[PDB]
């Protein structure tokens, strides 16, 4: 059980420049984990999973970053649309398991 | 589209049971790793069960012993047998096909509400 | 494998031994501590059965 | 029967137990009768990389 | 910037010092293996102690090392005019073997 | 147990600088054991250059890789490091040391001083 922590807890930022957020472990986490942004409504949606490798579809607009122990997860151009909750999973423990972090919430202006 | 739309979810007096139900389409679950996790009001998600493909089944401490996975291989769809729902267990449950380190979690479910009477 | 992996994530060596007992011409088993000798004296003796 | 596996897979080698390692590539009765021996060894098959 | 080590120490002779090794990087990865070596002036490095906590046998009974977090305590009791000497730090990081910003030790 | 280095001591701008370690007491064939290149600057830090495992699987510095193919020879126990494109950075000291797992360069070399210029 390593315990993930994500930050901020919320952000509105104006459209179209850059964000980053961070999401902390505590243990080893090497290149075990993944990003989901569910927007409020429906089932999440898979972003950057492993260490920086953007999901399929997912715009190249994201940009996923960090191993071991800390992540983090960036924006070029933030769309009206983009305002969601993400989340980073890990995966350490295939076997059954998963971690979650406490969320982010994403908003523009 | 390859989907898993859940069935069941509604109200129950404590002590109750009930029974949540998963169905698959133009997707097999029997050769599917599947995973049942549940979400509480406004909170994360958390894993709550899994059946292998071999049939070998798994489920969390939190749910264990009331809880029950199962899968109608023949028609591609999942099923979770609830029983003595307390308070703790009011949440919105998931069937989720979990695929690991070759692709994380994608394809999931619109959910279903469980809540008690009180 | 490398070597930051946790000692969950670390390589095990391990070797598993399955024996069969049905049916057995006895091949594989032996301490047979060897008999120190003595002479000379009314002794038990048991020579290879 | 030698090979190499993970930290936390090891429990998976037991008479009757389901798992991954046991399910998909390796899997002993419930039956069986002998016993495995295991001793870690990360110092010959962990890479830098 | 991956790991880092201080300029110099001076402690009299015969009395104890303990030396750091930060890393002052994140994510070195588990930070489990951490060795230290011993440079002389101008000659090919000794392998002084490796296992932080352990040290090979074959050396002095002074070297002793330690971890306060994302650094190596190596402790020196009893210092002795011999242990003037260039000190470095090992330790892997996720991808590769990386190595301290060197120290100099000086017995004085 | 023993390693050492030879080669060019002095080499001119962009030019193929060739050094060859030969050691006795080990060889490379047992499992675990690898060589590896380090190179200090004068009064300066100790960097990575590159290692070869036992296996033949190699590894090279990530800054500066693509370059210097280390190849080696167990039989007469002869490790050979090549760098090209010779600059005036270049100018430090050159160890070859055996490298474990656990005890990090426990058998070091001698090392040779390298000039870079005219």
Redesign the interface.
């Known amino acids: 059980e390593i315990v993930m922590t994500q930050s901020p807890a919320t952000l509105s930022v104006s459209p179209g420049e850059r964000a980053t957020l961070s999401c902390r472990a505590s243990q080893s986490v090497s290149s075990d984990l993944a990003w989901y942004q569910q927007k409020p409504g429906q089932a999440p949606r898979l972003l950057i999973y492993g260490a920086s490798t953007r999901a399929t579809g997912i715009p190249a607009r994201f940009s996923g970053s960090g191993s071991g122990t800390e992540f983090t997860l960036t924006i070029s151009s933030l769309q009206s649309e983009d305002s969601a909750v993400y989340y980073c999973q890990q995966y350490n423990n295939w076997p059954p398991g998963y971690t979650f972090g406490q969320g982010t919430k994403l908003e523009i202006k | 589209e390859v989907q898993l739309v859940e069935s069941g979810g509604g109200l129950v007096q404590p002590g109750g049971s009930l029974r949540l139900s998963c169905a698959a389409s133009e997707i097999t679950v029997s050769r599917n790793y599947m995973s049942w996790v549940r979400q509480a009001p406004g909170k994360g998600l958390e894993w709550v069960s899994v059946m292998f493909a071999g049939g070998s089944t798994f489920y969390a401490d939190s749910v264990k012993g009331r809880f029950t996975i199962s899968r109608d291989n023949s028609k591609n769809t999942l099923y979770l047998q609830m029983n003595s729902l307390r308070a703790e267990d009011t949440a919105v449950y998931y069937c989720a096909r979990d695929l690991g380190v070759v692709g994380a979690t994608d394809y999931w479910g619109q959910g279903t509400l469980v809540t008690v009477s009180s | 494998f490398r070597p930051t992996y946790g000692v969950g994530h670390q390589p095990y060596r391990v070797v598993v031994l399955s024996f069969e007992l049905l049916h057995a011409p006895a091949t594989v088993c032996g301490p047979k501590k060897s008999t120190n000798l003595v002479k000379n004296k009314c002794v038990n003796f048991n020579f290879n059965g | 029967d030698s090979f190499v596996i993970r930290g936390n897979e090891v429990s998976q080698i037991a008479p009757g137990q389901t798992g991954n390692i046991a399910d998909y590539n390796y899997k002993l009765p419930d039956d069986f009768t002998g016993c495995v021996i295991a001793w870690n060894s990360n110092k010959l098959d962990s890479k830098v990389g | 910037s991956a790991l880092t080590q201080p300029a110099s120490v001076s402690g009299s002779p015969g009395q104890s010092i303990t030396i750091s090794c930060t890393a002052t990087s994140?994510?070195?990865?588990?930070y489990?293996?951490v060795?230290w070596?011993q440079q002389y002036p101008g000659k090919?490095?000794?392998?002084m102690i490796?296992?932080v906590s352990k040290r090979?046998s074959g050396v002095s009974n002074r070297f002793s090392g330690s971890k306060s977090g994302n650094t190596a305590s190596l402790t020196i009791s009893g210092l002795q005019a011999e242990d003037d000497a260039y000190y470095?730090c090992?330790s892997?990081?996720?991808?590769?073997?990386?190595?301290?910003?060197?120290t100099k030790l000086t017995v004085l | 147990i023993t390693l050492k280095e030879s080669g060019p001591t002095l080499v001119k701008p962009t030019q193929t600088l060739t050094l060859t370690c030969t050691f006795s007491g080990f060889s490379l064939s047992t499992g675990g054991v690898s060589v590896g290149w380090i190179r200090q600057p004068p009064g300066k830090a100790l960097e990575w250059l590159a290692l070869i495992y036992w296996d033949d699987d190699k590894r090279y510095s990530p800054s500066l890789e693509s370059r210097l193919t280390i190849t080696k020879d167990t039989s007469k126990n002869l490790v050979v490091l090549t760098l090209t494109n010779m600059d005036p950075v270049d100018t430090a000291t050159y160890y070859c040391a055996h490298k474990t797992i656990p005890t990090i360069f426990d058998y070091w070399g001698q090392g040779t001083l390298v000039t870079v210029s005219s």
């Open positions: 994140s994510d070195v990865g588990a489990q293996y060795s070596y090919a490095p000794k392998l490796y296992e090979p470095y090992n892997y990081t996720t991808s590769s073997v990386v190595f301290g910003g060197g």
